[PDB]
Write a protein that binds this ligand. Structure first.
Ligand SMILES: CC(C)(Oc1ccc(CCCN(CCc2c(F)cccc2Cl)C(=O)Nc2cccc(Cl)c2Cl)cc1)C(=O)O
Ligand SMILES: CC(C)(Oc1ccc(CCCN(CCc2c(F)cccc2Cl)C(=O)Nc2cccc(Cl)c2Cl)cc1)C(=O)O
Lengths: 271, 270
């Protein structure tokens, strides 16, 4: 409609504000320039990361890169705990979605398991910059260069996500649209092992229609809307595909570094 | 020709369809359940109105209320802003009727002066409901309760119309019928200052003729509809008189509020 659909693209919006502490507009906030309200402790190297492990208080020993675990692997490790924490908000997000909680628990898991990462790599863009990423609830800011300065296996597992973030932030979206662009990716019927495909697909459509008129209310000046946003939903389906591969290679040669159980469950079917 | 009279009534319908931004079909379809829709933003308080001004915009007017122009006066400002736009559509409608467009400009004006509010009050029913009414191209829906909760002057100038629309919509007319009805109330030979009243009288007769015959093929089992629509015309002719009087009082008592120049011309001697 034009209101019931206006209240739908709104409800999901509150579900997106009450489940994600770091919103794009609250992140774009820090990454300003003439802002001293919040100055993020920049990393760029092993020294700043070490003290960051103190100045930004991270419960996991004042660092964590001995002759068993190293710098690189400790970042990857740090990377997965945030992810695991974001998978958590997404779950609480999707559950706040209307007909989502309608689905049987098994289907809710299938949707998350397969779309929780495409969604997260999409929000990544919200806290990104051409020169770095926001970490530690806005208090940190790990430079992009620093991350490319990581070991061989790792290091190249975060750069493509930047390549995407750059472009994806060129569409100039805002939290309102993101709330809908996320719920759309989670409510994806093309997910493997989905039980009530017709149902999911139906909720999807109303999502994409909600996102439809909404890109009309807020943004009235382009064409990014859908052919670009929808194409980016596909672009994300590959980023995840390439990401699941490095992950499988890491698990196959990085016998030293562990993988969070939850993340091991998510992977093991994708290809 | 009794036959072929059901042909020029389609040309009057085409003028209606191509000129009025809101048709009773689009309205009935909007004031009906939200089963796949648009859903209007209910305006019932001062807050929903302020919200409205933002959500549904409205460009002009808007603003505050205590200074000179107030909340009630704000509504009356909005009413007269759409009344001046439906007058613009009515005038284009009348112009899309050869017969009408045949008369001399000066006559076309006198007709579009004594009849435009009567038409205007017949169309209001299409966009009205038992409880409230559509505004801003179906975008909004200002309730009847909100309207009658205004300052006593402005409060009772909108109520008689609701009273009228409820009964009118019981006749169950559609747009093809309203096109004819509206056209009949416009081309009325009994208007003050009419120059060529005979010609006008005649054009009306053909409209009333097609109209009675149109009610044939469209409302078969319908009761005494034609003559019923005739009494409505007279009803419409009196409500426009009491409205003109209410307007007369607000022009004497409500000097703080202003009236649209085109609207003062219409009432300059009505
Ligand atoms: C196995 C794993 C964890 O791989 C990933 C690897 C990297 C990323 C991306 C960037 C990591 N990240 C943001 C996660 C996030 C978030 F918190 C909110 C929204 C979106 C996103 Cl993407 C982050 O905060 N990392 C970090 C912390 C301290 C130091 C350093 Cl040197 C780094 Cl790179 C995502 C998944 C996965 O796919 O689940
Ligand atoms: C001086 C004046 C203007 O007095 C009137 C007062 C009210 C009306 C009728 C209702 C007004 N209207 C529809 C005009 C219309 C139309 F747009 C299409 C077909 C028919 C009609 Cl009768 C409307 O949209 N009003 C409105 C807008 C915003 C908020 C609120 Cl609280 C309101 Cl009441 C008519 C004349 C007049 O006599 O012309």
């Amino acid at each position: 409609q034009v209101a019931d659909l206006k209240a739908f693209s709104k409800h999901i919006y509150n579900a997106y504000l009450k489940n994600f502490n770091m919103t794009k507009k609250k992140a774009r906030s820090i990454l300003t320039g003439k802002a001293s309200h919040t100055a993020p402790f920049v990393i760029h190297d092993i020294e700043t990361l070490w003290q960051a492990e103190k100045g930004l208080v991270w419960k996991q020993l004042v660092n964590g890169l001995p002759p068993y675990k190293e710098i690189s692997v400790h970042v990857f490790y740090r990377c997965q705990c945030t992810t695991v924490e974001t998978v958590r908000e997404l779950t609480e997000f999707a559950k706040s979605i209307p007909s989502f909680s309608s689905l049987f628990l098994n289907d809710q898991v299938t949707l998350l398991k397969y779309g929780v990462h495409e969604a997260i790599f999409a929000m990544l863009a919200s806290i990104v910059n051409k020169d770095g990423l926001l970490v530690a609830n806005g208090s940190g800011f790990v430079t992009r260069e620093f991350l490319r300065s990581l070991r061989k296996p790792f290091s190249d597992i975060i750069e493509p996500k930047f390549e995407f973030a750059v472009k994806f932030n060129a569409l100039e979206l805002d939290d309102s649209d993101l709330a809908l662009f996320i719920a759309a990716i989670i409510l994806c019927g093309d997910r493997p092992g989905l039980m009530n495909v017709p149902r999911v697909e139906a909720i999807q459509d109303t999502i994409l229609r909600a996102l439809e008129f909404h890109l009309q209310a807020n943004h009235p000046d382009a064409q990014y809307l859908f052919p670009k946003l929808l194409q980016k939903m596909a672009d994300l389906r590959q980023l995840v595909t390439e990401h699941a591969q490095m992950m499988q290679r890491i698990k196959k040669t990085e016998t030293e570094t562990s993988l969070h159980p939850l993340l091991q469950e998510i992977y093991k079917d994708m290809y």
